[PDB]
Amino acid sequence: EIGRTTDPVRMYMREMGTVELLTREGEIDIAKRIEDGINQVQCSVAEYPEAITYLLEQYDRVEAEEARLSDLITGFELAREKFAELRAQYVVTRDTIKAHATAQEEILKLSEVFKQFRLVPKQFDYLVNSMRVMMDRVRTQERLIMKLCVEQCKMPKKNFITLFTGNETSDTWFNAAIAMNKPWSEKLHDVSEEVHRALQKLQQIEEETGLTIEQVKDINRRMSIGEAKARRAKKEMVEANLRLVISIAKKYTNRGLQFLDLIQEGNIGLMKAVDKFEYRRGYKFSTYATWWIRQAITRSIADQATAREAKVLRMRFGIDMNTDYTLEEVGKQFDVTRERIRQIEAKALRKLR
Amino acid sequence: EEFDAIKIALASPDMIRSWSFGEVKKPETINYRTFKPERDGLFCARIFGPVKDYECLCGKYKRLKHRGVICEKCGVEVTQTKVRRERMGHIELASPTAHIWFLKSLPSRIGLLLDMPLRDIERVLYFESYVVIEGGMTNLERQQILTEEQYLDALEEFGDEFDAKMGAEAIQALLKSMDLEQECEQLREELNETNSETKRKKLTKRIKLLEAFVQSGNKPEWMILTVLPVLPPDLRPLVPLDGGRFATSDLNDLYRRVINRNNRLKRLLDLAAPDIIVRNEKRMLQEAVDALLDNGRRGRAITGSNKRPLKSLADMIKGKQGRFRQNLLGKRVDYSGRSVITVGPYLRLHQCGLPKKMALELFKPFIYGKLELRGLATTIKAAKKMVEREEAVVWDILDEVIREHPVLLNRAPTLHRLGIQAFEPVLIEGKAIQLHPLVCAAYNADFDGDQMAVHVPLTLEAQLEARALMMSTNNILSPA
Amino acid sequence: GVLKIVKVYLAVKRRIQPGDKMAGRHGNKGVISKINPIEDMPYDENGTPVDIVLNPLGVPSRMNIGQILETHLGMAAKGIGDKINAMLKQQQEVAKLREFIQRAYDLGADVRQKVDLSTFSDEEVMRLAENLRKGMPIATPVFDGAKEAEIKELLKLGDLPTSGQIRLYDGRTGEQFERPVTVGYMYMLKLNHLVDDKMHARSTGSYSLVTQQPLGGKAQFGGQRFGEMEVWALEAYGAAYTLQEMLTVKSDDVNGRTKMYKNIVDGNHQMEPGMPESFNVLLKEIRSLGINIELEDE
Amino acid sequence: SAAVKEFFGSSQLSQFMDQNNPLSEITHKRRISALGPGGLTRERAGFEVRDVHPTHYGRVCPIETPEGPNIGLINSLSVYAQTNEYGFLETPYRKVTDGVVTDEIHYLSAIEEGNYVIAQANSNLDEEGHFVEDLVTCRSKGESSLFSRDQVDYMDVSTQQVVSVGASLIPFLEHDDANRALMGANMQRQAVPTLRADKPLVGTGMERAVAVDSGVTAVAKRGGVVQYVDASRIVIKVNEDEMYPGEA
Amino acid sequence: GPEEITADIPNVGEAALSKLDESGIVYIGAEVTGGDILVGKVTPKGETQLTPEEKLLRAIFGEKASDVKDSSLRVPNGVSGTVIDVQVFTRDGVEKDKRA
Amino acid sequence: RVKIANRELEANGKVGATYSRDLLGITKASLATESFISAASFQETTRVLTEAAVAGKRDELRGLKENVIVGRLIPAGTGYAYHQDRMRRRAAG
Amino acid sequence: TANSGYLTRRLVDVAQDLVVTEDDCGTHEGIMMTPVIEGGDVKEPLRDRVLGRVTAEDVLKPGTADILVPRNTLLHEQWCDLLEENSVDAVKVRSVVSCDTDFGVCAHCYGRDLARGHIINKGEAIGVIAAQSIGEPGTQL
Amino acid sequence: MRLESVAKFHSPKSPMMSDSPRATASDSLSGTDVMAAMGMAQSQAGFGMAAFCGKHELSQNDKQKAINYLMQFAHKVSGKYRGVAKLEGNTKAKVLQVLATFAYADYCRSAATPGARCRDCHGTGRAVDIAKTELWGRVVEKECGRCKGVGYSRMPASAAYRAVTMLIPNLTQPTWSRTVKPLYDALVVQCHKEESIADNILNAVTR
RNA sequence: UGGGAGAGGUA
DNA sequence: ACCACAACGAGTTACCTCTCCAAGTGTCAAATTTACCCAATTTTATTCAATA
DNA sequence: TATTGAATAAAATTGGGTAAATTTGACACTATAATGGGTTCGCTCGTTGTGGT
Ligand SMILES: [Mg+2]
Ligand SMILES: [Zn+2]
Ligand SMILES: [Zn+2]
Ligand SMILES: [Zn+2]
């Protein structure tokens, strides 16, 4: 009963004992819903041509050989010829974007050629983060433009709603909102610099995505409901496996920590387990999860238990001396620097080659 | 150092940031291989000052010629290590937590403010139930507690209009949103129509609390901590034992637990965690802060290794072994010693027999002064060897010094004021004090093993106070 | 963590001195106040001085009369030992020794001990007289004691006064105490509360880490605790300067105590006091409780 | 091993032994503590647990205890006191039959003696027969009143049955006030051993029992004759009767 | 650095070194007083600086911790008496001493 | 304070207040004294510091316990002259 | 002795700040000291009950000689013998409970400093003296 | 030489963090006999001890002692400066007080004065030249160009001038530099002289 | 260095 | 309007003795310091003549 | 015959900024199945707030 207790682990046991336990098939189709959410956000970024031109940007800078393709793409050697084919697909979608159903079906063709565009999972995390940077950057530019485009009005929204169904870019809806003889018109007709700044920002959006705000706004809505369904399925998966964290956290109870701190470290380990969980390997959930639970708990218990640029490579690579030296000892005996010598030797390696 | 008042009030988060010298960010105290503090730890030298007297940590700047200098290899300013008991830190809490004193020290100071039950307040802080803050509809009234079922049906019903929160952030929002002047006017006009005596006394309690708040100038939301100050490290030291193992500092353990749970709450809030895990982590941080402030008050006492409850800051303040009652109203004292008393039946009424070794130890800076004034000792090492070898000239100097210098003689328990009396000492061979047989009724001192303490007064004011007030030939009659 | 351990054992002989605690067996404790010469101790007309002079005014308030009865029985036992020692020093016979020791043995009223030296061979009687030449030991069970009639009977055997009291002479003036004084042989013990362990003194030493007050204990050279009741006693006297001296410059005021030491060595007995460091400890702890306390300047 | 070493090293009843004289160690080894794990606590004990209950006659000493804040809570076992197999204290009595006080010894526990009339040890006997008087003192059902010479059921086995070991070394204890006899029994245990030992001329006869039973002397395991004495060794040739047929 | 128990004690007078033996332990029978030495244990203080003086010292002698802090066991003050028993325990591997 | 307020009220010619004496016990009077340093150093330090921190008080150091804790001369005996000197300084200043 | 120490601590802490701060409050209140005659005997007579006080008003009896001692006089020993030889019944004297001095008492409503015999000075911690004097024989109770 | 060890000794007891402590000998000195030697060396050379303790903010009461000794020295030495030697009594006492206080604050000013540390070097007065490290390989140092090597902003002498022309209004800056400011520089040179002679007498005592 | 427990003791 | 529960706080003072209380290591983006420039701005000894 | 105030030039300081080093903090090490915890009493007496027919 809510009320008569003060033991925090008793309240936590009472809280976790309400969500039911999954069966063998329940985690399977919950992971299927997780797969549906991640391919949902993958197909909303597949149609997005800005991800395509940024991956082409990363392609023609890695064609200058600054990085390796081992930590860039997991597959679909074959990488060079396949990326040449994808560059050909990029340039045919580039020069045939000017014409409109052919442009539509070539957006479909670049989104389905994105279906083999699978990369290594650390770089895939970095790619969904960089897509968050640029894509959510133009998302929050649209968000600041809609908040800034509603806050200056201070009128009833209804005529602005019927005006908002159009383009909301140029000055003809501005003149339509001016020529409708209301007292807010003659005091708000000085909004021309606001809609003109929205005009130049929207021409940046026009060279960015090709067309209007409505398609990218519903694409943002698709990304939002995809990530929301993924978050809700992740919550439904972690809320039916806390008993696993209790069953593992009992074995390390008197090893430097209290009880609930072990449970919370295991909860973070379970979140990292379900974030990296795949279902097609046949193993159900527990033998994959218990590795991350035990590892996070024992790690928390372990926790509670140019002449200069030439000479740094001289004392760095084991050359011109007896034994090798890592990035720590010659850093601390050279200067007080630790990662600066890594930047210095990276500049030396990208300079002399 | 002139002042004429001592003023107490509540502490702003910007006030705690103004006392602060840097945020403690990691729960490590010191490295244990090399006894050096960690960066941004609980013992950090860049925040709390250097360890050695007039050095830095890396030992580059060793001399006093760099009297205040921020070093470059480590960043710890070379100065006195006296600053390690004056410089406080702070901890930016990842969520607001309630202060245990203004929640449990009865009357509860929040249930007296908002007029809420303490059970409902604790049920909100314990993440067991919601409470509405502002209702745009007429269906919901302020300070109404909702269960989670009621919260879900009202959330799907009204959609977005009301806003109910849960935990200490909800109570901080309530205290931020309340209006003390309008509440005081409403209660003052309520007190006219109040005929019930219990409602009258409860209303006078609440009215005086509101009037105290508006006349002191404290905001009422400062009873909910958002920044947590950190005691300086020389006031919670690490004491090594003899076997290379440090001793358990309970304040360091509780501070370390707060930093660990706060870092984990920051990682959960950044990782977009599920709400059950986030609420459990916030509840653990709230109880860890409450344990640090006053351990054995809200729930069970958090114990240490030896199954004793840990000391907290309220334990360091309160009690017979507390700071007040053990170090401010009475303390240990230099120029003092003790021995067994015997009878001197050959003394006058103003004389005590004081042993030679005792008076020689108690009177050593006076002997150094007369050794300089007579010229028998020119260097301090020579004076040290002269007093240590106990030369006959040193005994002559001691007989000159002891002469007309009263000492205070005290026997516990000092039940009344005639258990401290000033006598003029006679230097006798032996190890026992020789009390005069007539003052034994005042001291209640028979000779079956009673011991007494000698206390040397130093200044001329203290010597004349002992001569004119506390001399045993002034205390002839009782005061009782 | 250790390599080798060296343990060293010392051994001291501690003679008694003024201030050493001493007791009998009947709850009569006492502290030695003086060590008097043999020519100053009182004596009887054989010139034997007394070893210990106790106070008679400690008896009739505490009502331990076993003190007095043990004194009288010890006087009787030592008288028997004196007569056996006289016969042994004169080398009388074995028959005289056997007769006298037998007479001293079968002396009580209806006592249960039956010792008979007829079975004792002469070497055993000489050995028994040698062990009895310093006084015949006497048993007396609890609640089964010797009566005053048997004590007086043993005193009459030992050619001593029956009332227990002899006439003592003054050690110094040579005159005589006007009344007869109870003289006998109590059994004194030396308790472990010695003035070598109680005596302590300290001018300046080490200080505690948090509070900056002097340490506590003879083991680590500490200061005597000027507690709350002594603060009240100085407040009742009015000694405001003595109380400020106790609270600041003999205590946790650092600049005040350094300046007081060098001012005393400079011959200028004058203090300049300031804030005790335990008050700053208190201010920092009430501040670390999230409560802004501050010395308001005027 | 961790639990049993924790107990034996640092329990509240595993005390550093007093070793001033042999009486100190033997009184420590015969001590009874009301405190500890499962027992009382020193600060919150009243006057009712710190009093001499009438069932302490022969089991617990009434005049040996500390004189501080520990006064009724630390006691001392009496001289003849035993335990049951259950752990209750019992003390021996001589059964009288038809006035004839025999030499048969019964250890009566604390509740069994509360039924019978038990004579005092200071009652007079003759010819190994009966009492010399009619109105004989006794104690029964707590109180102690006068009884007839045939009604009596038991007698105390000795006159020192009440007092402990250290309280039965005091000569003329019956002429002492109890407040001073308590302190004498306490202060005998703080007496340092001096350079040359010196027997008391006035004693009790319990001294030989304490000195042998303390284990602080060297008693002879098998009798015989002494072959070689030293300052640090005694070599005893055993009699051939006590000698075993396979040894020297 | 590991400590050692040897009679070689720096900056002390040779009067106090009469009571010790050649192995650093006091003789059985020596009447010690307060402020005397019973067993000579020295501690490595620490290099922490590179001056030509200490460089020439470690060149000429080889006492590579030539700054050592004498932390010998001394008898506490006011205590006297003879020495009747000395017991030396050692761990495995370390060769003990002539005195041991 | 009530007598001083009624004194100034009859000085400036007004109504004045009607009071009633309250016999408090020793513990209740020494905790309800008007100085939180003395009340905290006597008893119930948590409750005394909590109420004083909420009310925003200030100790004027008028008493022996406060001048012992802070460390100045007590207003008694030989310190009475210095304390009335400080009073006339900070009053006539 | 545990209860006596706790009572003496509570008494000193209730009466620590009471200092003689004035010289005369100039009031006319006081207590009428009469000899305690409770039971069948006198317990403490008027001489012991009034020796060292200060008269709140003049003595006004026809009596035996119509004695008049003036207001605000410290009753000495010979004044107590004057009260004896004229057999005075009762006398209203001032007390500290009726001193009109705020923040302390006056010297005349306390009277004789009993440790010294003369009248009390100002700047005396009479509350600490009073609390020690009451709590000291608690061990004798 | 000798004096700064005593400034180490004026602190409270600091916690040690090492292995086996407590040398328990008279190797250097104790902590109380150093103060006893400061007391023995106070009858002569008390000026420099008071000035040193006031400069290093240990025993912050002898700042007034050092200002009083400097005022006595200025009263004895004022008969050789043409600007001050013609003034009347209490006015000359007040100008000697104000320039003694400003001269002592100028002597006290080091890199630990609040608001006086250099902006770039943070008091060390020693920055690293990046070009010489790039051409040499090793790490080099140079003089901090903002502070010009001293590590702290020096006290301008015109602060005393502004604080005296609120009392002597008709004293302009050229005559201030001509016949007043040598007395100010004589005061700070006397502070350094007294500190040196007190360190010499301290080393003569504790030898 | 110097902190905390527990045990016993003295007045 | 008028009574039975939890929890706090209190229990003298001082002193003494004892026992017992893993591992860098590579990498990456963003924020932060740091060595330097520089215009303004203040400081301080020096010059010119005009009285002294 | 000096000495002093207005003017002054050179140097020290200061507030602001700024491009470029460089430091900070976080990560990162991966698959049979495994799914709800071990503390506490004989340890008295007064007070006070909180909750209850
Ligand atoms: Mg006594
Ligand atoms: Zn450094
Ligand atoms: Zn009056
Ligand atoms: Zn600089």
- Residue E15 sits in a domain of what CATH number? 2.40.50.150
Q: Which nucleotide is nearest to D31 (CA to C1')?
A: I8
Q: Which residues from 116-155 of A have any strand K atom under 7 Å from their CB? A: 121-122, 125
Strand partners, E32: E81
Amino acid (one-letter) located at A4: R
The residue behind tokens 């005086």 is B208
Q: How far apart are the first and last CA of chain H?
A: 12
Distance CA H122, CA H139 (A): 19
Beta partners for residue D176, in sequence order: C64
- Give the residue from G27, A151, A264, C239 showing the smallest Cα distance to B421: C239
CA C43, C48, C53, C54 torsion-angle sign:
negative
Tell me: is residue G99 an annotated ligand-binding position.
yes
Domain range enclosing E64: 1-94
Q: State whether B10 and F50 contact (CB < 8 Å).
A: no
Structure tokens at E66: 């030539």
Report d(CA C93, CA C87) in Å as an integer: 8
What lies within 8 Å, CB to CB, of B14 at 6+ separation is none
Angle of helix A8-16 versus helix A259-275 axis, rounded to 10: 30
Name the residues in H6-45 having a C-beta closer than 7 Å to nucleic acid strand I.
13, 15-16, 21-22
How many cross-chain Cβ pairs, B to H, lie less than 8 Å apart? 92
Is E50 contained in some domain?
yes
Chains E and F touch (3+ CB pairs under 8 A): no
Q: CB < 7 Å to strand J — which of 232-251 in chain B?
A: 241, 247-248
G127 C-alpha to center of ligand 3: Å? 19
Q: Which residues pair with D32 in a beta bridge?
A: D75
Query: What is d(CA B63, CA D58) in angstroms, rounded to the nearest whole number?
Result: 77
Q: Write the CB contacts of E62 (distance below 8 Å, at least 6 apart in sequence).
A: none
Q: How far apart are CA A253 and CA A261, in angstroms?
A: 10
CB burial readout A265-275, b (16+ within 10 A) else e:
bbbbbbbbbbe
Write out chain H residues lying below 8 Å of B239, CB-based: 15
Are the C-beta atoms of residues C278 and C212 closer than 8 Å to each other?
A: yes
Question: Exposure string (b/e) for A330-344, b if CB count within 10 Å is 16 or more?
Answer: bbeebbeeeeebeeb
Give the CA radius of gyration of chain H.
Answer: 22
- Report the alpha-carbon angle A286-A289-A294, nearest 5: 115
The string of DSSP letters for G78-131 reads HHHHHHHHTT---EEE--GGG---SSSB-STTT-B-TTTSSB--SS--HHHHHH
Resolution as reported, in Å: 3.4
* Structural domain contains residue E100: no
Burial E62-92 (b: 16+ CB within 10 A, else e): eeeebebbbbbbbbeeeeeeebeebebeeee
Of D125, D167, D203, give the one whose Cα is nearest residue D23: D167
Residues, beta carbon < 5 Å, ion ligand 1: B 446, 450
| CB of D40 within 7 Å of some strand K atom | yes
G80 annotated binding-site participant = no
C218 touches strand J (CB under 7 A): yes
| Residue closest to B261 by CA, chosen among B287, B300, B229, B223 | B287
Distance CA C133, CA A7 (A): 80
- Residue E18 falls within a domain, yes or no? yes
Task: Give the E-state strand segments of C141-223 in sequence order.
Answer: 165-166, 181-182, 189-190, 200-202
Q: What are phi and psi of B77, to 5 degrees?
A: -70, 130
H/E element, D228: strand D224-229
Are the CB atoms for B358 and B454 separated by under 8 Å? yes
- Three-state SS for H113-145 is CCCCECCCCCCCCEECCHHHHHHHCCCCCEECC
**Burial of D68 per CB tally in 10 Å (0-12, 13-18, 19+):** exposed
Give CA–CA dist E50/E53, Å, rounded.
8
Q: Are strands F58-59 and B5-10 parallel, antiparallel or unpaired?
A: antiparallel
Residue C255: burial class (beta carbons within 10 Å; 0-12, 13-18, 19+): buried
Residue A89, SS3?
helix
Interface residue H21 vs chain A (CB under 8 A): no
G82–C contact, CB cutoff 8 A: no
- Rounded to a whole number of angstroms, the distance between the first and last alpha carbons of chain C is 57
Which of C191, C228, C265, C282 best probes binding to B when mutated, by most B CB atoms within 10 angstroms? C265
Asked if residue E99 is part of any domain, the answer here is no
G40/F contact by beta carbon, under 8 A:
no
Is residue G15 within 8 Å of G130, Cβ to Cβ?
A: yes
User: Where are the alpha helices (H) located in B12-115, listed in sequence order?
Assistant: 13-19, 45-48, 101-104
Quickly name the fold that domain D78-158 has: Rna Polymerase Beta Subunit; Chain: C, domain 4 (2.30.150)
Pairwise CA distance, residues B28 & G82, whole Å: 83
By three-state DSSP, how is residue B44 classified?
A: coil
- Omega cis (within 30) before B107: yes
Cα D189 to the chain's mean position, in Å?
Answer: 15
Is the CB of G17 less than 8 angstroms away from the CB of F64?
A: yes
Spatial separation of the C-alpha atoms in residues B185 and F84, rounded to whole Å:
43
Are C266 and H43 in contact, with CB atoms under 8 Å apart? Answer: yes
CA geometry: angle C235, C236, C242, nearest 5 deg: 45
Q: Is B66 part of the contact surface with chain H (CB cutoff 8 Å)?
A: yes
**Sign of the C-alpha dihedral computed for residues C248, C249, C251 and C252 taken in this order:** positive
Neighbours of ion ligand 3 (CB under 5 A): G 25-27, 100
Q: What is the DSSP string of E69-89?
A: EE--EEPPTT--BEEEEEEEE
Give helix B392-402 / helix B364-374 axis angle, nearest 10°.
Answer: 110
CB neighbour class for E44 (10 Å; exposed up to 12, middle 13-18, buried from 19): middle
d(CA H192, CA H207): 23
User: Does F67 reach chain G within 8 Å, measured CB to CB?
Assistant: no
Q: Check if B415 contacts G (Cβ < 8 Å).
A: yes
